[PDB]
């Protein structure tokens, strides 16, 4: 297989570090060629626990989060808070698919537990205020794809379509 894992994209101040291996070679599935992000791996039936940033499993397909694919490892001190799984290469859920993939998957998602005492409520959170998205490029879209501004001029299409396509729900706690 080609081991990977998943990261989310909220407006939240919790996106500091969740990965050791970022490249694992010279291949990613969420490649970029002057059309913005490709192959956005979408999950549904979940929300984000952005404060204590993690994906909390609710049980409504109305809730969802859309992040990207990172081919590597999240600190390897996990499975206390994550979920691992291998897929038959189309149990995925993409956005703007590019092509066929390498038959094998391994993705670790930042997961959280219920703590069921409060009547938690889901709310829609859209990527807005392109200042924080400028910071987002400065923090979660410079080092992961530094080939941008070195192979792609379109550093504007990226912020536009992050404004448009990346949206998610939260827990409001």
């Amino acid at each position: 297989s080609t081991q990977r894992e998943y990261v989310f994209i909220p407006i939240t101040n919790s996106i500091t570090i969740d990965v050791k291996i970022t490249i694992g070679g010279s291949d990613h599935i969420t490649n970029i060629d002057e059309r913005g992000i490709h192959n956005v791996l979408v999950i549904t039936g979940y929300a984000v626990d952005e404060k204590n940033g993690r994906l909390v499993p609710t049980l409504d397909p109305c809730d969802y989060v859309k992040g990207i694919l990172v081919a590597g490892t999240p600190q390897q001190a996990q499975s206390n808070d994550f979920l691992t799984l291998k897929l038959p290469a189309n149990k995925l859920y993409l956005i703007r698919k590019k092509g066929n993939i390498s038959d094998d998957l391994k993705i670790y998602i930042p997961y959280s537990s219920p703590d069921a005492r409060n009547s938690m409520k889901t709310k829609p959170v859209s990527i807005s205020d392109d200042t924080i998205v400028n910071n987002i490029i400065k923090e979660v879209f410079d080092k992961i794809y530094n080939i941008t501004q070195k192979e792609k001029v379109k550093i504007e299409k990226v912020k536009e379509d992050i404004k448009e396509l990346f949206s998610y729900y939260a827990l409001e706690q």
Binding site: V42, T44, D60, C62, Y93, K97, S126, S167
Partner: protein, 467 residues
Amino acid sequence: EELLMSLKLKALYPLTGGYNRHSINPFYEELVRPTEIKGLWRWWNRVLFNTLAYSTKGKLYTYESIDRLFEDVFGSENKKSAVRLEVITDEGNDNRFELSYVELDKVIDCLRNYKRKVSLDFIDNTLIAEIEGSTKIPISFKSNLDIDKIIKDLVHNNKLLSFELLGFKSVEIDATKISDKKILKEILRDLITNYLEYFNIKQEVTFTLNIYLDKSREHKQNFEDKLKFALYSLLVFILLGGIGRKTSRGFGSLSIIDVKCYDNSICKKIEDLAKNFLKISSGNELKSKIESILDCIKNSCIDTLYIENNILSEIDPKKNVVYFINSDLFEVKRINDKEKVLANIYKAVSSEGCCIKSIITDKYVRKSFLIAFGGYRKVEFIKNYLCETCETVSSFNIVDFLLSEGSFMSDYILQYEHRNSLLRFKLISDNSNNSYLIGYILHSSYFKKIDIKYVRCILEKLTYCVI
């Protein structure tokens, strides 16, 4: 005659039209046409009646038979309708469209002795008379039509509105023989008006639809249960469809606001199912209510008491197409803002739409899925996915299709320009600033038999991606 009920409704971005396909004309303004409400009511009544008659008896009746059956409420050439529709609205006073002046004496001079096209376009709140022969002119004008930038970019971003605008924006003009100026003024003012009226697109159109009942058509044999089924189909229509054009793509979608009734003995359960939609918590609750009302017709303590009459007639599946609800392909999602949804629905039904090249991700297969569902496409293999008797990889098998040999269903699916879209889209709201897209797929009587939840997987991938 006395009032039956009255449904305060609301239309979202309706695209009506009369004698000129726009909702406004030099003489009056008409946002909601009671004729369209009556016609769409009858069409939804036929769809709902076939849904019921195919659930309970696995049979499908022709439209002529169904409305011949419902004659005693909807009327025909032999009997006047018993239901009198109404449409009342705010600003129902004189609201015509007046073009006070338009300064185009110059483009005329640009059109002397030249066989040249004259296209129009709004370019940053200034309209340009782009002459295709390498010329552009910022026409100026004044009109009581206050087109806001919201509407301009709603039409510019929505790649389907900008497509039905190809016929209200362009005139080929032949002045090579000779052309007066007072005649080109007339031609160009006609062009300008046909373009301007296209942007009368309102929103939040709110209208009170009254229903009056002919008492003299009291219960003869089955008048009461016919009329009750008719009110149920009115509900189905208000909940799944919309007024105007491109309602199969979200526009004109309707939303209940208040339903006061005046004869409980006919309308009690109808008003109840109506008032259930005055406030909807979240997505799947609305889904549950849609299902509850779709199957209150099929399996509640009353379903039908008149199908036992032999006025009807079975469809000839080699001749006829009929639509009916499946009551299981009804994915719902919340949208939080309605304009971008409509702008994205084009991604969900376009052959190279980036929201479909992700869900099916194949040539000749997206094409088949969009020729079977999704209304009449312009086809230029693929029919191998559309056979009746051939390799069933993805079950899009049409009833009477046969390879390299045309039959009625063959021409009808490939070459018949007026064919509704089975894949439809609805935008609803409940007066609480929350809104849920409703996607679904009507079942056609030309599908041999489909793999339901495979297409349901497709449909939910759409309704999740199309936002």
